[PDB]
Amino acid sequence: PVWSEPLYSLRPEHARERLQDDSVETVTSIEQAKVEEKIQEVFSSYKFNHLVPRLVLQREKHFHYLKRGLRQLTDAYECLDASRPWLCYWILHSLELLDEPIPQIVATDVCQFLELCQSPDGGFGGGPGQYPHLAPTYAAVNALCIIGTEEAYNVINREKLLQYLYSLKQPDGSFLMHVGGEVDVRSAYCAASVASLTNIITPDLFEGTAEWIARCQNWEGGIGGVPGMEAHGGYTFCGLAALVILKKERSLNLKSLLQWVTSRQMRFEGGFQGRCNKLVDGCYSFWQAGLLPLLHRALHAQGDPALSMSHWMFHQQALQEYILMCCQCPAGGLLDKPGKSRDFYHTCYCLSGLSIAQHFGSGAMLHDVVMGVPENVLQPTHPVYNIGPDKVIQATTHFLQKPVPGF
């Protein structure tokens, strides 16, 4: 009927989904109430201003923000001087999702720059002359694959990459992030992501790795940074995704993991939180929500008959609503929540999240939900690597023609 509201977050019933603090106030309830109030204003902003709600992804605004940052950044990104390949990846992937050609002039410059970041001892650094580290190595490789040219592929030194991964491997199955550096589940995923793409996985490289990742799953259902730690979205994604790569998803209690991830979607905001009883954040639109395609593919491998053939196991509508209404900066770029300032990290993962909530893919079954104007539709992304599904296939196919270093 005509009294019917097409937007889930604006519906009258939705008001009952506000926080009930049971009249017991703590720092957690107060802070969650503040965000909920801030999100409410954004939702009922249309009724107040007396306008018809329309959901537009500011494609051109975001593009300009991205096109520029890919070349030059203000001194605000001094705190990311040791994460420059991440800047390449975040931006290139964002451009790819918005479906923007990467000029072969830019492609070759990115290549040349990443080559300067690459260590003689293997892997990539945060910038020229910095020591190799697994985060920017994951970022470099991902970026080069998005570019996908022969030039890009050849940048990577596969012998040295494998040597580097070995020099980080621990007896208990974990990896260091870099030499003399910390250990947590990010290293597992980074190691697995680059090793599988470049076809460098030896039989023993990931010995005990899957078991160590399994030890990271806790009483919450989710995965923590190291064994014993609180379940967290970014770490959970890393673990699950790493396990999908090693084809050892079943080492985990997938049942309790699913319960945990689906509980991370906020009933009022529609976006995700990183861990129980914390605040919503647009970048978890990927880390958390991106787990559902992983779980869907894992359960389907077991032969789970109850799996849906059209939707992921989260409120896809409500996540899109949250991103489009609350996470867009008018000047371009995307953000954590209203009140926060844009950055390339949140731009990357809000759009990766949106793409996820827009696209369903299970073999021959393909269903979409594109909220607001249909031009909001993005390019799909691979739930494991978070680069274009075509780029994953293109890269693996290329590197499979190479032998695993050492015959």
């Binding site: 720092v27 830019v106 699913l258």
Partner: protein, 323 residues
Amino acid sequence: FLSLDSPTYVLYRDRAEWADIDPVPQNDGPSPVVQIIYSEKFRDVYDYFRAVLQRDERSERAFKLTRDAIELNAANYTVWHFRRVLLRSLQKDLQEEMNYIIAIIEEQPKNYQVWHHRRVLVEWLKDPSQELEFIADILNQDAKNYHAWQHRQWVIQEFRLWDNELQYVDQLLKEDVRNNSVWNQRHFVISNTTGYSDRAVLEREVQYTLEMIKLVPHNESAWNYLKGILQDRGLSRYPNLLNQLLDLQPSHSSPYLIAFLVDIYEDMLENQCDNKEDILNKALELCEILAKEKDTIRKEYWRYIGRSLQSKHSRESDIPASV
């Protein structure tokens, strides 16, 4: 000597003790990407850091230079690596260094490199005596800081300082019962000391948990903890639980209570039990109330559970097709 935020701070290229060294500009290439327009202070320090690193100059002046490089970017792990090389080479007093890292963590507590640096120091000194109290102070300003809890777990595990942690947990749960980090620390302490098989301990915990649920019915952390400690052995193994949760149905109802009942019925239906069809209907009914009314945000999950329970626990489930 001279601080980075000092009004009389001078650039390194205008310093005498530094005239012998030529600075090393960043090798960004002919035409660069994601190029950062560094400030004067930033580029000056890092041009000089690139030099001492390049020459592997293990000197006192270089040690002081890393302090500035770190202050400009605490996330630069290369600089932290070189500083640790310097700490050993120059034989620096590590308690002084601990005083330094304490300060830096206070101002940038969400940084990866600063916590690892402290770990390394504690490892070198074999001295955890300052740790619990330092971490408590960080947790006093942010009670959920991930790296802080992680460090606290590592310290407690390595140095076996379990004695007082449960008490610490109780204080913080007092302060904020919704703090999921503290509920995780509680599971961490208990399961590494007494464990949850001691029936008296499992008793004490569940009474405490239900007690907190009584006080704050809509706190998800207590519900998750209650589930976390009982689901290992099976929920149906505890038949009194199902009834006692149904007692809070009218006065302490929540979307989490309804979900828990589904989990109890779920395990009941797995371990063949009484009325293996009446219990199913109870569960599918509650699944639909959740997917359509009480917890619609998880509609896709709650319609999946119903379709999983009908897939194996209906009366028609193990019955052949021809029948």
